[PDB]
Amino acid sequence: MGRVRTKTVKKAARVIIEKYYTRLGNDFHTNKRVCEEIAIIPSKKLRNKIAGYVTHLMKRIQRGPVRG
Amino acid sequence: AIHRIRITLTSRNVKSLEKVCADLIRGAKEKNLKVKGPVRMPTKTLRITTRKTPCGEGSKTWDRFQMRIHKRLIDLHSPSEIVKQITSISIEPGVEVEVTIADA
Amino acid sequence: PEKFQHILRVLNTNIDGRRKIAFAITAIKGVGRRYAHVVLRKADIDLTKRAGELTEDEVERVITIMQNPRQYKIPDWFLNRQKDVKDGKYSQVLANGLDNKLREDLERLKKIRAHRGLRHFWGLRVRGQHTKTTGRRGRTVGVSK
Amino acid sequence: PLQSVQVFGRKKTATAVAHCKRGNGLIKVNGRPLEMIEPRTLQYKLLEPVLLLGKERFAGVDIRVRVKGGGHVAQIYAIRQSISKALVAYYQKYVDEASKKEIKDILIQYDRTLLVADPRRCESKKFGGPGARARYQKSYR
Amino acid sequence: QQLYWSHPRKFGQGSRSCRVCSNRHGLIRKYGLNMCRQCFRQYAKDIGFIKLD
Amino acid sequence: TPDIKLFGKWSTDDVQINDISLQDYIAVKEKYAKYLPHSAGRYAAKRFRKAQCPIVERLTNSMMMHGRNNGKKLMTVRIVKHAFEIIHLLTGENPLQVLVNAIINSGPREDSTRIGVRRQAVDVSPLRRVNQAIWLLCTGAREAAFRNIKTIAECLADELINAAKGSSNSYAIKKKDELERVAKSNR
Amino acid sequence: VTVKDVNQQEFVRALAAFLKKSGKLKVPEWVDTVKLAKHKELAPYDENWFYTRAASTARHLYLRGGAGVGSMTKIYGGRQRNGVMPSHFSRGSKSVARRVLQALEGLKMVEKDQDWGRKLTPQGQRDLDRIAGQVAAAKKK
Amino acid sequence: NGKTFNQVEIKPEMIGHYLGEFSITYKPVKHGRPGIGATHSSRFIP
RNA sequence: AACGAGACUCUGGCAUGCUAACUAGUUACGCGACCCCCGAGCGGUCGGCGUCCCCCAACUUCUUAGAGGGACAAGUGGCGUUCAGCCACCCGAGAUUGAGCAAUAACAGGUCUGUGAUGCCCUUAGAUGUCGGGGCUGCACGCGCGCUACACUGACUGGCUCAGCGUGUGCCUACCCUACGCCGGCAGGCGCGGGUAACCCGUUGAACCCCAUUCGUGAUGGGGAUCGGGGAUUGCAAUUAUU
C-alpha cells in the first residue's frame, strides 16, 4: 500500500503553520480553502495532501510542542 | 437582405480555438446578429504504431504515435457584407476558419 | 419389424440395412452425403426409415436413378465427371469405375511426361506444398562416422 | 401536474432508460411485455423488484423502458436497475419521503446493484502477448 | 538509343518509394504520408504526431 | 410474503446442517435465499468474502470448467436445475438436503503435507473442507459422463445421492478415504 | 393483438401454415436441390422450407421496413468453418432472398417504396395482426 | 530452362498445356550423409 | 546541495448542477395517417402498436465536449521508543484503475542492406551503374513460435435476438467505401444513386450464447489431411497448382 508523505509535503506544511497559525483549525474543508490563498501550489492533488498534513499537525500542537 | 450563414473552425490545439471562438460570439452578440451557439462535433484521432528498432534486433518494443483534431460550427442571421468584417479579427493563431453563404 | 433382411448388396458393395437410408447408400464410392439426399428426393422415398425397410422395387428405383442422373433432371453442376477429356460427356462415376477413371488420368499425365506425372511417379507432393518439414515417413539418421 | 420522471441504469457498455407516468400498471421494454425478453433462463432477474415489493406499489404508474449497447446478459442487468431506480425517484417527487425509505431499504437488503452501478470495464491489450496479462511463450535451447 | 528501355510499374513495390530517401522497404501509406518507417520516427514531431500512452 | 423465496420450486426453511464446524461456511437460508444461482457479485476482492456466496452458485461456478466450457454459465444453470429435479424423483427428499449432506460427507479432515517421497500429517480448516468437497464431486460427475449415453444432469444426480449416504461407489468418498489413509501413515 | 404482443416462434409457424394453405404463393423449380447458403454443409431437413422463409421475411418487414435483397442476406448470415483454418462470418444466398420478396409482392402483401427498398401494404399489416389474435386465443387467456 | 534449351516433340496429347510444363528448372534430390550441426548431440570441442 | 524515486502528462469510474445543438435526441401536442378490438366501453373523445409523417411546440434525462467540482489515510476504534506509520469499520461513484516518461557507469551487443550520415580499401566500359528466363518454395533427417482436433457439457438443419475501436475517391504514384433494382445454385455480372464523411455504406440485424429437430458410444452423421474433374475474379503473365 504505502501512505508515507514525501519531504515536499512535510516541509510546505511546517512553513504554512509557522506563518498562519491564527487562520487554521480542525476542519479539513476550511484548511483546504486557506492553503489555496496563502500559497501558490501547482496541482489540486498536491494541495489536498498539504492541507491533510496541516490538519494532522494542528491536532498535535493542541497537546504539546512539535520540535520543528 | 439578410441570410442564414455558417462558419466552421478546426485545429489540433484546443485552448487557442476556445479564445478564437469566444471572440466570434462577442462580436456577433454586441451587434445583435442573433448567433446560434458553438456546436462541438466529435473529436477525431489519428494513430500510427511502429517497431522502435532501426534494424530488427532486440526484445520486441513498439512506439504508439497519435494526433487529435477538434472541430466547431457557429450559425449567424445577417447580411453577406458583415461576416467579412467579424471573421477577420483575433484569428492570428494556427486555426482553420471556413465560411459558406447558405446552410440554414 | 417383419424380421426382414438387414444386410444387402447393391453395386458390387455391401450396405448395412441398419442405418437411416440417406446414410446407408454412402457406402458406395462416388456417393457422398449431398448426392445421396438428392437421389432419394427424386426417387420419392421417405428419409425417416432404416435401409432394411425398403422393398425390392424401391431399391431398383434408387439404383436406376444413380446410374442415369441427367434423365431424372439432376443438374449438370452436381456431377463428378464434367466434359470428360476423351469424349466430352457429363456423368457421375461410381464403384470400380471411379478407380479406373483415376488410373487412366495418372497414366495420361505420365505418358507425355508433364510435371504432374513426374511428381506422382517420384511419390512427392503434387500440389503447391513445401517439403522441408512436413510429410516425413522415413527413419531418423545419425551424424556419426 | 402531468406527473412523470425519466431515469437510467447501466452495466458494461449497455444503458437502459425508464420513463414512468401516472397510470394503471403497464410495464414494457422496447414495446414488448417483460415476460417475453429472449434469455428466459434469467426471467426471475427482471421480475425481482415487482416480486420483492409486490404489485400494489406499481398499480398507480405506467413504465416504458428503452435499452441499447452491450450484449444479451448485460442488458438484463441494465433493465433490472432502471425499473427499481425509477420507482424510488417517482415516489420521492410526488409522495411522502417516509414511504421512499420503505422502498429503498427493502431493495438494498436483498441486493446492491438494484440501485448503485457496477464500475468494472475492460483492461486494454499490451504488446508482447494475446491480452492484458497473458504473454507469448519463452524458449531457450 | 533503345525503344524498349522500361517495363510496367503501375502496382507493387516497383511503383512506390520513400519521399525523403528513395528506399522501398517498410514504408507507411497511411493518411498519405509515404515516408519510410525509419524516416517517420525522425520527422514525427515536425509533422505534429506525439505520444501519450 | 417476500421473506420466503422458493429458488423457483424448492424450500430452504426445512434444511439442516449437522456438522457444527461447517455452519459458518455453507451459505443457505435467510439473506442467502435467492431465486436463481446466478449473480454478478464481486466475491474475489478480499480473503474470506468467498464464504458469503450461496452454495448452489459455488456448485454452478465450479461446473463451467474443463477448457471447452469456460465462461458458459447459462448452460451450467440448467445442468444444476435438471439434476435437482432427478434427485427429487429418486429420493422423495428436498434436493438442498441431499447437496448439504453430500458436502458434509465428502470433505477430508486430516491430510499430509510434503517435506522431501517424505510427508507429515496436518489438520484441515473448515473453508478448505468445503472447497475440497465441491471439486471432488464435480470431478466425479465429469469423469463418468465422458463416453456414456448418460447425460451430465443424470451423472451429477447419481454422484450427489451416493455421497449423501457415504456408499463408496462415488468418486468423492473413495478419494477422501484415500487421503485420510495416507495421512494416518505419516503421523 | 399486435405482432409485438405474442411469442415470435409459434407466430412464424402459424403464419407459415396460413401461406401454405392459401395455394397462391409460387415456388421455384430448384427448391429441392439448393444449399440455401454458402457456409452450410447440407440442404434443409424440411420439404416445406420456402413457406417458413416467406413467413419469417414478412415478420421482419413488419418490425423494420425499407429492407432490400442485400440487407436480407445479412439477416440470414452465419459462421463458416474453414477446415484447418480459423472461422469467419458469411452472408446468405441472393437468389433465394430476391425470389422470396417477389413471391410476397404477388400476394399483394409487399410494395417497392419511395427512396429505395420494400415495405408491407395495409393488407399485409391486417393479415399479420389477424394471426397474432389467433396465436393469443390458442393459449386460452 | 534458366541456362539451357530442352527440346520437345509436341505430341497431340499436349494440347492446352503450357510449353514450360515439359522443361524442368531443377535436378531431383538424392541425399549425401548429414554434416556437423545437423542434430543437438553433434557438437565439436577442440 | 544535485540527479533518480515521487510529483508530472494521458486514461477509467461519478454530476437529473453549469454552457447549448435541423451533421444529436427525448417528451408532448395542433394534430394527420395505417392496423387491431384485446379495453371501462363501439367501428369513439378515451385504449394498444411505430426508425409512419409535419411543428413557425417545449426541453437537455439518454449522445457529443468545454469549464469547474470530488478523496485527504479526512472521520471513529485498536496497535505503535504513542513520532513516522500499520489493521478493521462507518459514510461514499470511488479507500491497490492502466499506460507514458526515467539516473551515473558500461557491452568490442545489433545495425555500413533506412539515408545525398561517413573514414580507409576494392571496382569502374569484355563494369561490382537496364531488359528476357531461372532461384529465394528444392527434401532420408534434428529443433523453435503456432492453427485444427480426439466428440453427446457434441455435430447437423431451422427459428429468435444483442457490440465497440476504426477506415474510405492516392496531391509523382492513377487504385477508394457501398445502398437499391435486375440475371445466376454458387463465386460472380449489368444498371443506376450517396459519401472528401456525427450528414452516405449505417439503427454498423457480428460470433459464441438462446429455443425446437435429427443421430446413439460405432474412427460414427467425431476429424478433414491427401488427391481427380469442372467454373469465376486480379494481372503485362497464374505450370512448380495467386485467391
Side-chain angles (χ1 to χ4, degrees):
Chain A
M1 187 194 297
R3 294 283 184 134
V4 186
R5 303 175 181 93
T6 297
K7 75 182 73 175
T8 53
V9 176
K10 285 186 172 117
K11 293 200 297 178
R14 292 167 189 149
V15 177
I16 284 170
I17 292 170
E18 287 169 19
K19 284 176 164 64
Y20 290 104
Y21 173 78
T22 58
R23 293 281 201 74
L24 295 168
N26 291 6
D27 178 27
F28 170 75
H29 300 283
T30 298
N31 290 339
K32 187 177 73 151
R33 286 281 184 267
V34 173
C35 294
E36 187 164 82
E37 299 206 331
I38 68 180
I40 298 177
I41 297 165
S43 286
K44 176 162 59 181
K45 182 150 53 179
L46 179 59
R47 184 205 68 194
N48 295 343
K49 290 179 185 283
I50 290 169
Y53 198 62
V54 169
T55 305
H56 186 71
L57 287 172
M58 293 302 298
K59 289 174 55 162
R60 288 183 64 207
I61 290 163
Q62 287 162 20
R63 310 189 307 209
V66 178
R67 79 181 293 188
Chain B
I2 72 173
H3 291 349
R4 300 97 171 268
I5 193 159
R6 173 171 280 177
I7 305 164
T8 184
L9 299 95
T10 304
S11 67
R12 301 195 307 253
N13 179 262
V14 182
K15 300 201 172 192
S16 306
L17 173 62
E18 290 291 9
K19 72 169 185 176
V20 171
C21 192
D23 286 354
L24 294 179
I25 297 299
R26 291 191 302 117
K29 282 183 181 285
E30 80 176 40
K31 302 197 179 192
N32 312 96
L33 307 187
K34 288 179 287 188
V35 66
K36 198 175 179 181
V39 183
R40 293 179 187 77
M41 293 280 107
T43 50
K44 310 182 91 77
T45 310
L46 312 185
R47 296 189 188 82
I48 288 175
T49 301
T50 57
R51 286 285 293 280
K52 288 190 176 183
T53 181
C55 65
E57 187 269 336
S59 89
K60 297 181 174 68
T61 60
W62 295 80
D63 255 330
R64 293 189 295 241
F65 294 99
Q66 70 181 255
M67 184 194 292
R68 301 187 189 184
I69 298 172
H70 300 89
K71 177 176 178 179
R72 294 188 183 184
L73 310 170
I74 63 178
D75 304 352
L76 290 162
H77 301 84
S78 67
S80 308
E81 295 178 42
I82 71 175
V83 298
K84 298 180 184 181
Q85 179 181 117
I86 66 175
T87 321
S88 76
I89 66 173
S90 302
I91 290 163
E92 284 86 343
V95 178
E96 290 203 331
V97 181
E98 293 177 324
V99 57
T100 189
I101 197 159
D103 203 29
Chain C
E2 299 199 306
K3 309 193 185 195
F4 205 84
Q5 180 167 342
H6 284 287
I7 293 184
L8 69 159
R9 190 170 178 87
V10 168
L11 286 176
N12 298 322
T13 187
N14 293 350
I15 310 304
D16 52 308
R18 193 165 58 213
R19 281 185 287 171
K20 305 283 281 197
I21 180 61
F23 292 90
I25 68 172
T26 67
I28 303 162
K29 294 187 70 175
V31 178
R33 304 178 195 186
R34 184 71 164 108
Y35 183 74
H37 284 217
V38 174
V39 165
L40 294 167
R41 195 76 68 103
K42 297 306 187 191
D44 190 17
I45 287 177
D46 177 352
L47 272 62
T48 60
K49 51 155 50 70
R50 300 276 166 179
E53 305 186 81
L54 293 188
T55 59
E56 295 176 34
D57 53 283
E58 282 168 306
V59 295
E60 292 289 354
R61 199 164 73 233
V62 173
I63 293 161
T64 53
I65 290 166
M66 288 191 295
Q67 293 192 341
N68 295 91
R70 279 171 47 81
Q71 87 188 27
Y72 300 99
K73 215 191 305 194
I74 298 181
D76 286 337
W77 60 267
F78 230 95
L79 308 174
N80 79 340
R81 204 73 177 186
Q82 303 275 340
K83 291 205 292 276
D84 195 19
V85 183
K86 294 190 293 183
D87 69 1
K89 297 180 188 293
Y90 293 75
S91 65
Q92 194 82 359
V93 297
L94 262 61
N96 80 323
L98 177 61
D99 296 345
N100 290 339
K101 193 64 64 170
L102 175 62
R103 202 197 313 284
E104 289 184 50
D105 282 340
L106 302 190
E107 188 62 36
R108 173 174 57 76
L109 290 166
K110 188 184 173 189
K111 185 61 180 179
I112 63 174
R113 65 181 293 118
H115 190 58
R116 290 266 299 285
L118 297 176
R119 298 289 281 189
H120 269 288
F121 179 64
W122 299 329
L124 296 160
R125 289 287 161 92
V126 175
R127 301 179 182 197
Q129 301 101 318
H130 298 176
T131 66
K132 191 173 186 173
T133 58
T134 57
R136 293 189 180 178
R137 285 296 179 265
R139 296 166 69 143
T140 305
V141 291
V143 300
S144 308
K145 296 92 188 172
Chain D
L2 191 148
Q3 188 161 350
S4 76
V5 190
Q6 295 180 201
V7 312
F8 70 87
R10 289 188 164 136
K11 181 160 170 62
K12 301 184 184 183
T13 64
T15 301
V17 187
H19 175 212
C20 81
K21 61 190 292 179
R22 193 181 185 88
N24 302 289
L26 174 141
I27 307 181
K28 300 294 181 82
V29 189
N30 294 344
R32 307 188 191 208
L34 85 171
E35 306 289 13
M36 280 162 45
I37 310 308
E38 193 266 311
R40 292 187 295 157
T41 294
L42 298 177
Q43 185 183 356
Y44 283 112
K45 283 286 161 203
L46 78 168
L47 290 180
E48 258 166 0
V50 66
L51 266 51
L52 188 72
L53 273 53
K55 65 175 66 73
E56 300 300 336
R57 298 194 188 250
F58 286 88
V61 297
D62 296 345
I63 314 179
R64 301 175 198 247
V65 188
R66 66 182 187 278
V67 59
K68 67 180 181 180
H72 295 307
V73 181
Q75 289 189 353
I76 300 298
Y77 287 83
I79 293 156
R80 189 182 76 136
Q81 182 176 320
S82 74
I83 294 172
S84 47
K85 190 174 171 186
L87 191 78
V88 73
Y90 181 92
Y91 272 57
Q92 181 160 50
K93 193 174 177 73
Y94 297 113
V95 309
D96 193 306
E97 270 266 333
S99 72
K100 186 192 69 74
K101 189 180 185 295
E102 297 182 9
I103 284 167
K104 211 193 73 170
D105 289 352
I106 293 294
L107 289 167
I108 294 180
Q109 288 174 13
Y110 178 80
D111 196 31
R112 285 176 64 88
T113 78
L114 288 172
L115 290 174
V116 184
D118 180 17
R120 294 180 289 174
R121 264 55 162 186
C122 294
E123 268 212 55
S124 58
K125 169 171 149 50
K126 283 78 177 171
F127 60 82
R133 304 298 181 89
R135 308 285 78 196
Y136 302 126
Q137 280 204 93
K138 190 167 176 180
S139 61
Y140 301 90
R141 284 173 252 285
Chain E
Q1 68 189 3
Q2 321 92 314
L3 186 140
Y4 287 87
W5 167 241
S6 281
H7 161 286
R9 288 181 175 97
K10 53 172 285 190
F11 48 74
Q13 305 193 48
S15 173
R16 66 193 68 108
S17 62
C18 179
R19 69 161 78 225
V20 183
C21 73
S22 193
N23 189 45
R24 294 184 182 273
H25 298 129
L27 88 168
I28 301 173
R29 295 165 68 184
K30 194 92 175 189
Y31 313 126
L33 285 169
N34 301 84
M35 285 186 168
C36 174
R37 68 178 186 86
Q38 291 96 334
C39 300
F40 179 75
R41 291 190 76 252
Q42 181 177 350
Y43 292 110
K45 290 286 297 294
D46 292 359
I47 298 164
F49 289 87
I50 60 172
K51 56 176 174 171
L52 296 164
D53 178 30
Chain F
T1 306
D3 52 323
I4 297 298
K5 289 172 279 277
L6 297 182
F7 190 67
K9 192 175 294 188
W10 313 113
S11 57
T12 57
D13 193 32
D14 52 290
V15 182
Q16 297 287 356
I17 297 167
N18 57 76
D19 183 332
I20 73 171
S21 66
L22 303 189
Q23 288 182 349
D24 310 313
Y25 293 100
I26 300 177
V28 183
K29 312 197 184 194
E30 303 181 29
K31 60 179 178 286
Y32 311 110
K34 307 295 180 191
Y35 293 98
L36 288 173
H38 189 148
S39 291
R42 295 182 293 276
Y43 297 114
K46 272 203 178 188
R47 188 161 112 109
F48 291 109
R49 188 83 68 80
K50 184 183 297 195
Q52 307 303 332
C53 187
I55 192 66
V56 289
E57 182 158 31
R58 296 193 68 194
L59 184 72
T60 303
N61 287 358
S62 308
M63 188 65 58
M64 59 165 178
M65 182 161 284
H66 211 291
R68 62 175 182 182
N69 310 122
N70 274 330
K72 299 190 188 186
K73 195 163 172 170
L74 293 187
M75 172 172 64
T76 302
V77 174
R78 68 162 170 280
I79 291 168
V80 172
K81 185 175 185 172
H82 300 157
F84 279 19
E85 289 184 325
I86 292 176
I87 288 169
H88 191 65
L89 294 174
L90 260 55
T91 65
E93 196 166 342
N94 186 338
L96 292 176
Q97 279 277 24
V98 184
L99 179 61
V100 168
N101 286 281
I103 288 164
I104 291 165
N105 292 340
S106 303
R109 42 180 182 182
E110 180 158 62
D111 194 9
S112 64
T113 191
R114 186 179 69 256
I115 62 169
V117 69
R118 196 182 185 178
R119 295 193 175 240
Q120 179 161 353
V122 290
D123 302 315
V124 183
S125 75
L127 184 56
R128 187 166 173 105
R129 289 225 289 148
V130 299
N131 295 352
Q132 281 270 60
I134 298 295
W135 185 94
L136 285 173
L137 67 86
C138 294
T139 303
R142 187 176 295 134
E143 294 288 312
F146 186 72
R147 290 194 186 113
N148 284 298
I149 305 179
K150 296 288 292 289
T151 70
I152 185 162
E154 293 157 35
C155 294
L156 184 62
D158 287 338
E159 195 67 14
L160 287 168
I161 289 168
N162 278 281
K165 76 190 302 287
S167 73
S168 192
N169 294 342
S170 56
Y171 180 85
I173 295 294
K174 286 185 67 174
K175 297 299 294 177
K176 188 201 179 185
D177 291 4
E178 184 182 56
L179 294 171
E180 288 179 10
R181 269 186 291 152
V182 175
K184 187 173 184 294
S185 76
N186 307 151
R187 290 186 172 165
Chain G
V1 181
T2 72
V3 177
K4 280 200 177 191
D5 302 309
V6 296
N7 191 65
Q8 300 292 284
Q9 296 200 322
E10 68 266 45
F11 180 84
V12 169
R13 294 193 291 259
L15 182 59
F18 172 79
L19 294 175
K20 200 262 185 179
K21 195 181 190 298
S22 75
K24 278 68 172 183
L25 189 80
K26 60 173 176 280
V27 305
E29 182 173 24
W30 45 247
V31 75
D32 70 343
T33 188
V34 297
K35 196 175 175 177
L36 193 53
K38 199 203 76 153
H39 55 266
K40 298 295 166 73
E41 204 67 10
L42 223 65
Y45 294 166
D46 189 0
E47 176 65 17
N48 311 273
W49 73 262
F50 189 88
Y51 300 100
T52 305
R53 202 65 157 213
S56 178
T57 299
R59 194 193 71 77
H60 279 292
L61 292 175
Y62 184 110
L63 295 173
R64 186 174 176 177
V69 173
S71 48
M72 297 305 303
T73 68
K74 176 159 45 168
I75 292 168
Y76 308 116
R79 187 173 67 157
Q80 190 177 1
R81 295 175 77 192
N82 296 304
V84 164
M85 290 196 288
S87 304
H88 297 298
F89 174 81
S90 169
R91 293 192 182 191
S93 159
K94 283 184 292 179
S95 188
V96 176
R98 190 169 70 258
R99 279 181 165 81
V100 169
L101 290 168
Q102 289 175 351
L104 293 176
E105 288 188 62
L107 295 182
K108 308 298 297 183
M109 304 214 307
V110 173
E111 277 172 336
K112 284 179 290 285
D113 66 334
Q114 295 188 342
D115 306 341
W116 312 94
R118 277 172 249 219
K119 71 181 174 70
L120 294 187
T121 61
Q123 181 173 357
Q125 189 182 7
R126 169 173 286 118
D127 288 350
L128 269 75
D129 288 347
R130 283 277 169 81
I131 287 169
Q134 178 181 289
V135 171
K139 297 184 181 182
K140 194 58 176 176
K141 292 178 178 290
Chain H
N1 204 27
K3 65 162 180 174
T4 54
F5 298 94
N6 295 311
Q7 70 177 12
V8 184
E9 161 72 327
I10 299 178
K11 302 304 201 300
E13 290 284 62
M14 301 179 169
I15 192 168
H17 298 78
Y18 297 89
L19 284 179
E21 194 164 354
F22 307 104
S23 180
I24 78 169
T25 60
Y26 73 100
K27 290 183 65 175
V29 178
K30 61 189 296 290
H31 290 291
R33 198 72 196 291
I36 295 89
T39 65
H40 285 180
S41 194
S42 70
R43 210 166 198 137
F44 170 71
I45 68 176

